[PDB]
Design a binder for this molecule. Structure first.
Ligand SMILES: O=C(O)CNC(=O)C(=O)O
Ligand SMILES: [Mg+2]
Ligand code: NI
Ligand SMILES: [Zn+2]
Length: 331
């Protein structure tokens, strides 16, 4: 078995290997990358996402989200308070302000220490989940707006044509902005490109151990767990690496820098934080190997998770027994 310790793997494809996206994902899996739940892909030196980032300041963040924490430093939830619209240029200036800027630090490890010590005492503002793309239309390789769609994959594997669409999302971050512990909708893959700015630190639990994280989460968030049998789908719970280690949960960590891709694999729980002002693009995708994960994915039906239009068909076709309850949660 390749990668039996489930380490995060880093890949350096050549420009020739960067042509065929599906082929390369399958290659990474042949080497055991998916066992980690997360892999890093460093693009060939010849590649670029676009020519410059000099002209992005007029993008609008219609609903910036202030991430307010509750709990203790290593075990907390966050809720998202909606703020007034602002442009990317305004948000960048806010991120760089004395109130929100990255503190002085020695290295990524020092900064990580500071994050987990102090995160709860601040409320950073995240420009998350903005439909759009920063890839140039002429970028032919690993362009996240030109990937094969999940609806086409389901049709190719299973024969059923379905409605829905699959487009990327932009994320503008600042110091301490946080992504809570989650797997993707329908336990899909994700791919994330860090276009510019400061790094993003990731934590990940191997897919084969995801239920160990779920069991800890039910212990640590006992009210939430009574409310919903899949409350991690709400994407609000944080657990620090120290707490995970104290509880014997297998996990790994890595820091993504500008110019790098990360892929999350089906049922790979992940969480993390941004180091300072940055912009990422991410989208979900599927492969043939995903279908069995999609059929077994948990679902939130309590009403909290509320998701895209396109998840309807995935539940309807892959999980017809669950469909009626899940759709009630959507309504
Ligand atoms: O970058 C973020 O805030 C969160 N991203 C993801 O969870 C992802 O790409 O799957
Ligand atoms: Mg602009
Ligand atoms: Ni994700
Ligand atoms: Zn729920």
């Amino acid at each position: 078995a390749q990668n039996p310790n489930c380490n995060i793997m880093i890949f350096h494809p050549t420009k020739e290997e960067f042509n065929d996206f599906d082929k390369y994902i399958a290659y990474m899996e042949s080497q055991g990358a998916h066992r980690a739940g997360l892999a890093k892909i460093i693009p060939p030196k010849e590649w670029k996402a676009r020519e410059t980032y000099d002209n992005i300041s007029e993008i609008l963040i219609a609903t910036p989200l202030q991430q307010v924490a509750s709990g203790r430093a290593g075990v907390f939830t966050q809720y998202h308070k909606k703020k007034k619209a602002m442009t990317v240029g305004e948000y960048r200036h806010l991120a760089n302000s004395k109130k929100y800027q990255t503190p002085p630090h020695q290295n990524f490890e020092d900064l990580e220490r500071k994050y987990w010590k102090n995160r709860i005492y601040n409320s950073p503002i995240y420009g998350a989940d903005i439909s759009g793309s920063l890839f140039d239309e002429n970028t032919k390789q690993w362009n996240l707006g030109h990937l094969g769609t999940i609806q086409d994959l389901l049709e190719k594997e299973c024969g059923v044509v379905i409605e829905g669409v699959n487009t990327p999302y932009l994320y503008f971050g600042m110091w301490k902005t946080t992504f809570a512990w989650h797997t993707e909708d329908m336990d899909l893959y994700s791919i994330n490109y860090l276009h510019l700015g400061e790094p993003k630190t990731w934590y990940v639990v191997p897919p084969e151990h995801g239920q160990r994280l779920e069991r800890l989460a039910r212990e640590l968030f006992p009210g939430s767990s009574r409310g919903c049998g899949a409350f991690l789908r709400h994407k609000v719970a944080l657990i620090s690496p120290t707490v995970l280690k104290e509880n014997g949960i297998p996990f790994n960590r890595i820091t993504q820098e500008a110019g790098e891709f990360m892929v999350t694999f089906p049922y790979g729980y992940h969480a993390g934080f941004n180091h300072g002002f940055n912009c990422a693009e991410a989208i979900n995708f599927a492969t043939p190997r995903w279908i069995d994960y999609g059929k077994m994915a948990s679902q939130c039906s309590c009403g909290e998770a509320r998701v895209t239009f396109s998840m309807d068909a995935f539940v309807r076709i892959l999980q017809p027994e669950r469909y009626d309850l899940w759709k009630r949660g959507q309504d």
